[PDB]
Design a protein around this nucleic acid. Structure first.
Ligand SMILES: [Mg+2]
Ligand SMILES: [Mg+2]
Length: 1223
RNA sequence: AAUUUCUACUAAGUGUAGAUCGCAUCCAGUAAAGCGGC
DNA sequence: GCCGCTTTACTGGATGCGTAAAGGACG
DNA sequence: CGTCCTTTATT
């Protein structure tokens, strides 16, 4: 009611409506006969090609400067960049330095005198014909001699590359804003970690990577940046961090690889380096050597047959390798060795059937010498055997035969396994013989052929496992005696079997690539700017315009031969007529009023006083230090008079300008032109003539259509279908404008009609909803699946502009604060993320009362009494594992972004419904860049998509049921978030949306506000001794069977935050602990009081003795304290959760509230309408919402001039005094 | 199981409900398999 | 599980445009 | 000389 109505007509944004275009009458017949589509098809392919050559020239022009660029005073930027103490004056000083560094790069591209010609028709007619040396590339640019405006959008994408501003697509942005900070940040890390770099490691990287031409320390000096400005330098720089791969496959290690080895050997966390991003428009060949993938299906086959058949060496390698293990007994059992790795536990199984016997057998050997009888099994003796067992490089066949008990002979059972595994491979060929024949011809493309691939994948994985098994027998020796008679033959075969490793690589990279599909192609109809705008004065120029015949809108296109065929038409008084558009638009008043009145054609006709042309030149009409008021007034009066004397503007638009003496700036004037320089009207044009123009092929005509436009549809239209209707409805006083830049694509069919899944007519189809009481539909017509891709389809993308002239101008975050300061019962929505519930909603009133809370794991909807509850969290979990198991098995990877998107729209709808009902602000978690990472497989990508599509909705929120001409409807939709420019331009609040920190949101007691601010991990006995003494009392309360731990927080460290300070903790309830190593459960439920009684009996403590603090401190045993502090750890462990278990995720508190009862969320999850959180997840969203109620409390005090300056970012100390006082 | 398109439907018979900014460019991120060092 | 190289997939953020009339070249 | 494709102007 009150709050939302204020937010209408707030700002201007554009959207795009999409429509299927259906050819009318003989339209498509004439389009085929004139071969128009094949020309645009052949063009859209050549258009990608010409662009590729254009990139070649740009990259060449890009590099001429970037090779030769020198950055002035680079150290100065570095100096202020690494200062731990800049002021509000030096912070503005480094920025002005950062701006000049990009300018230094930017003007060097523009300093060239060929710069401006890179984006005009000259580059295609002139420059590229000179640069190119191919006679075919010369011929593909010539066909575009007539179309150079079809590149205007491509040229804009390339001037961004030469921008000076901090823009993401700028080259200057890449080198300075991105590469420098990454380069500087590593310079801070190099110095910190330079100590751990061996002198050979410096020489290793210098000889192998740097070629002795540069020192390694050089690439961390300030002045050496100039090398890395190109891809040539970046490729070398990244190699210093990561290393690279030679021809022979040697993994040359980089600095990030060495720092890693040191931190695994000294158990530290020293920082690794950040690689550098690529340079814009670089075609980057990678330094690491890799064998190129196969181009086509035929190559893959010819390799597969020739390399993998029995005749080829790869089989001969196995054929001889089987011979070696057969005669295995002959060679010296001291000469053969089995490598040591974690993969040997499998080896122990293959001989005698147990994993850990080889480890256990050896452990008996190491123990007996180095187990003195005093200890029997100290932690140091058990833990040192692990150090020795992996340090061992390999095992000889006799140390394994010595471990083996008779009659088991290791050398014989080795012959058994190899004989078992090479028999398997000879049988996979039996199935795959159909792949090896010379005659075999593939039925379907390799990607469309899941049946042939699974055959190759099965033969390749069978060869891979036999080779991967044998690799362990090398032993990496470096061994005193090797039966080199054996290993000589072995090395000969195994290096040749190693050839499959490159085939396994390259085949995977071919088969698993998405198959060929024909993208839709833009239709030009022989005009480079086809259908660019709708102005009636341009109808001949663009050659397309819109037509209306009642409830149906058509798109008419005029053939190049008959450009003015729809202008000679007139009204037919008696017979049918079309409604023809009369579109009129004045784009860019700041760029169209001076462009015309100072243009060569009209500069004479309107003789601007020499005073004028010196005002526009000096820019005194602009606000700032050049600003003059009367000059602005005079510039206005010249434009005003000139328009009245301009015919095609004055007649077309009805102009009302307020008195020039009332304009405060030139912007106020241009706005009135813009708001009134748009008029859409309709004229009458004969149908029998226009239709004659379609049959004659002089005019092409499609119907604009979606399923709402069907005569069989009686249901609520799609939201965009409403927009389309308002564009031409006479109640749209400019709210939604018809913008230019429409496009028309052609998407050829991608599926065959005969191939489709069809539900045959008059045969019953089963309904999937178990709530739907009609489990069958019997239709009299066929239901083809994906029928929209079974036929060719025209596409029409029409951009629209909403609120191009915004009336209501004010700050939105400020206006939201204003109405919160005055709302008597404001509401807050709390939305909390999780991995057990994707999203949890909590709605609260101004007093923190819960009105609503439910999980959004499932979307529940009712229409006409037909409930349907979709389990989207299950749908996401199943599609995720349908891509995981797809990636493993080389099959098709299903798409999941749409499933997440379809979920959010159902979610977004629900929040907007809550926002409309309760007039509630929205509360989200303050998440920076780091939190996106997780330890388990996330759908938390849904959360990032949840904000984007929710913010996008709140930019222009509409209800499709309200009247469009009413507030909230289609023409007056609510705008309650700041315009979405980027995710990085965001602050702590965005209109109704508040991002708030999550500290103490979940592990806090709702009933009392109690929080765990004690550190309980065990460090020493004395630390434990001081701990127990600090508590006011530790007693047993027998009437309740509980232990009581009264404390004043001021006796512990870092308890400054808490308000109440004095709490009494009780060992009430059970907790959940996770194991550290068969067993039914990986967790147990400890009973605290039944465990304090347990601990206190093991050490002989009389816990009934009143106060027990001095009694527990009397102990001298470390084991007592290391477990006591553990029991103390669980009592303060409020949030108890278990991975992947639906049952467990509960919050329980060890404090009695005002009525002396503990908060156990389980006592709430059973309730339908609970007044407190039901679980740790709802507890999160509840508090996220209350943290915002605190902020509303700060708005109710401050005054509207200072409401903008209130800090809504909670202080961790302020939130505790609030959570403890609210109850 | 239809769709401008996506999702979920069949929703009373060629459809229902919700959502939907297209296009081009630069760049990055995640997952998987192989490959080398701990 | 950490570090690094590759290849395939699918996915996502940040930029530009959403223009009529002047301007010029051309048969 | 009219027609079609190119460049332009910046609250
Ligand atoms: Mg509908
Ligand atoms: Mg995934």
């Amino acid at each position: 009611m009150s709050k939302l109505e204020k937010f209408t007509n707030c700002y201007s944004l554009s959207k795009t409506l999409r429509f299927k275009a259906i050819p009318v009458g003989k339209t498509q017949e004439n389009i085929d006969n004139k071969r128009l589509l094949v020309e645009d098809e052949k063009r859209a392919e050549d258009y990608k090609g010409v662009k590729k050559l254009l990139d070649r020239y740009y990259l060449s022009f890009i590099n001429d400067v970037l090779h030769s660029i020198k950055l002035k005073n680079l150290n100065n930027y570095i100096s202020l960049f690494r200062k731990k103490t800049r002021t509000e004056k030096e912070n503005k000083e480094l920025e002005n330095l950062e701006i000049n560094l990009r300018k230094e790069i930017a003007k060097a591209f523009k300093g060239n005198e060929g710069y401006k010609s890179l984006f005009k028709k000259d580059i295609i007619e002139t420059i590229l014909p000179e640069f190119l040396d191919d006679k075919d590339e010369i011929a593909l640019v010539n066909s575009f001699n007539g179309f150079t405006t079809a590149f205007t959008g491509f040229f804009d994408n390339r001037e961004n590359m030469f921008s000076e501003e901090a823009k993401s697509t700028s080259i200057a942005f890449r080198c300075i804003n991105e590469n420098l900070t990454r380069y500087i940040s590593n310079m801070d890390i190099f110095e910190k970690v330079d100590a751990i770099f061996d002198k050979h490691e410096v020489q290793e990287i210098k000889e192998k990577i740097l070629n002795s031409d540069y020192d390694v320390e050089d690439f961390f000096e300030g002045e050496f940046f100039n090398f890395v400005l190109t891809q040539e330098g970046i490729d070398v720089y990244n190699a210093i961090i990561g290393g690279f791969v030679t021809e022979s496959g040697e993994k040359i290690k980089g600095l990030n690889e060495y720092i890693n080895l040191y931190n695994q050997k000294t158990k530290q966390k020293l920082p690794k380096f950040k690689p550098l991003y690529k340079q814009v428009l670089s075609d980057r060949e990678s330094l690491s050597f890799y064998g190129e993938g196969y181009t086509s299906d035929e190559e893959v086959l010819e390799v597969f047959r020739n390399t993998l058949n029995k005749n080829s060496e790869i089989f001969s390698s196995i054929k001889k390798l089987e011979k070696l293990f057969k005669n295995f007994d002959e060679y010296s059992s001291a000469g053969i060795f089995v490598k040591n790795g974690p993969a040997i536990s499998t080896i122990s199984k293959d001989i005698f059937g147990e994993w850990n016997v080889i480890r256990d057998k050896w452990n008996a050997e190491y123990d007996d010498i180095h187990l003195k009888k005093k200890a029997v099994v100290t932690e140091k003796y058990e833990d040192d055997r692990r150090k020795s067992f992996k340090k061992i490089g390999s095992f000889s066949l006799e140390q394994l035969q010595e471990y083996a008990d008779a009659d088991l002979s290791v050398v014989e059972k080795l012959k058994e396994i190899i004989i078992q595994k090479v028999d398997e491979i000879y049988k996979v060929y039996g199935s795959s013989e159909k792949l090896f024949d010379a005659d075999f011809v593939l039925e379907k493309s390799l990607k469309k052929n899941d049946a042939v691939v699974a055959i190759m994948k099965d033969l390749l994985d069978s060869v891979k496992s036999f080779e991967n098994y044998i690799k362990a027998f090398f032993g990496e020796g470096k061994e005193t005696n090797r039966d080199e008679s054996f290993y000589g033959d072995f090395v000969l075969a195994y290096d040749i079997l190693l050839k499959v490793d490159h085939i396994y690589d390259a085949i995977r990279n071919y088969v698993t690539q998405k198959p060929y599909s024909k993208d839709k192609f833009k239709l030009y109809f022989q005009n480079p700017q086809f259908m660019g705008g709708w102005d009636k004065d341009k109808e001949t120029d663009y050659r397309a315009t819109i037509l209306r015949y009642g409830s149906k809108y058509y798109l008419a296109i005029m053939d190049k031969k008959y450009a003015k065929c729809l202008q000679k038409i007139d009204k037919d008084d008696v017979n049918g007529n079309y409604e023809k558009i009369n579109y009129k638009l004045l784009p860019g008043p700041n760029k169209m009023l001076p462009k015309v009145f100072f243009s060569k054609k009209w500069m004479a006709y309107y003789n601007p006083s020499e005073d004028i042309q010196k005002i526009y030149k000096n820019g005194t009409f602009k606000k700032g230090d050049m600003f003059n008021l009367n000059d602005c007034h005079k510039l206005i009066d010249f434009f005003k008079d000139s328009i009245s004397r301009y015919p095609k503007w004055s007649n077309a638009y009805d102009f009302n300008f307020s008195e020039t003496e009332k304009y405060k700036d030139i912007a106020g004037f241009y706005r009135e032109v813009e708001e009134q320089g748009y008029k859409v009207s309709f004229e009458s044009a004969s149908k029998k003539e226009v239709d004659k123009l379609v049959e004659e092929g002089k005019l092409y005509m499609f119907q604009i259509y979606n399923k709402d436009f069907s005569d069989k549809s009686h249901g609520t239209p799609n939201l965009h279908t409403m927009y389309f209707k308002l564009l031409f409805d006479e109640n749209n006083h400019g709210q939604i404008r018809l913008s230019g830049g429409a496009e028309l694509f052609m998407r050829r069919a991608s599926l065959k009609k005969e191939e489709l899944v069809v539900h045959p007519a008059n045969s019953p189809i089963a309904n999937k909803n178990p709530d739907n009481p009609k489990k069958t539909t019997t239709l009299s017509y066929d239901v083809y699946k994906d029928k929209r891709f079974s036929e060719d389809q025209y596409e029409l993308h029409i951009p629209i502009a909403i609120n191009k002239c915004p009336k209501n101008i004010f700050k939105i975050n400020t206006e939201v604060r204003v109405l919160l300061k005055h709302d008597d019962n404001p509401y807050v929505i709390g939305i909390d993320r999780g991995e057990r519930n994707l999203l949890y909603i909590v709605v609260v009133d101004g007093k923190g009362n819960i009105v609503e809370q439910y999980s959004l794991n499932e979307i529940i909807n009712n229409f006409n009494g037909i409930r349907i509850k979709t389990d989207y969290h299950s749908l996401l979990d199943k599609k995720e594992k349908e891509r995981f198991e797809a990636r493993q098995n080389w099959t098709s990877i299903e798409n999941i972004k749409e499933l997440k998107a379809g979920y959010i729209s159902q979610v977004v709808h629900k929040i907007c419904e809550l926002v409309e009902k309760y007039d509630a602000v929205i509360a989200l978690e303050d998440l920076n860049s780091g939190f996106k990472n997780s330890r388990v497989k996330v759908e938390k990508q849904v959360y990032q998509k949840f904000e984007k599509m929710l913010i996008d909705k709140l930019n222009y929120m509409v209800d499709k049921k309200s009247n469009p001409c009413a507030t909230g409807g289609a023409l007056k939709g609510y705008q309650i978030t700041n315009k979405f420019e980027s995710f990085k331009s965001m602050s702590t609040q965005n209109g109704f949306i508040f991002y708030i920190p999550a500290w103490l949101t979940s592990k806090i007691d709702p009933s009392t506000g109690f929080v765990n601010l004690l550190k309980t991990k065990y460090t020493s006995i004395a630390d434990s001794k001081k701990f127990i003494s600090s508590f006011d009392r530790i007693m047993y309360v027998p009437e309740e069977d509980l232990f009581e731990f009264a404390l004043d927080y001021k006796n512990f460290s870092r308890t400054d935050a808490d308000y109440i300070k004095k709490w009494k903790l009780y060992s009430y309830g059970n907790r959940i602990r996770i194991f550290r190593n068969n067993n039914v459960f990986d967790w147990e439920e400890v009973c605290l009081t039944s465990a304090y009684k347990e601990l206190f009996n093991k050490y002989g403590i009389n816990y009934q003795q009143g106060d027990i603090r001095a009694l527990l401190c009397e102990q001298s045993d470390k084991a007592f304290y290391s477990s006591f502090m553990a029991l103390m750890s669980l009592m303060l462990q409020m949030r108890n959760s278990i991975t992947g278990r639906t049952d467990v995720d509960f919050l329980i508190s060890p404090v009695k509230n005002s009525d002396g009862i503990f908060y156990d969320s389980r006592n709430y999850e059973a309730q339908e309408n609970a007044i407190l959180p039901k679980n740790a997840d709802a507890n999160g969203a509840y508090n996220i919402a209350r943290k915002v109620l605190w902020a509303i409390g700060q708005f109710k005090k401050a005054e509207d001039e200072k409401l903008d300056k209130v800090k809504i970012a909670i202080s961790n100390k302020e939130w505790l005094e609030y959570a403890q006082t609210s109850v």
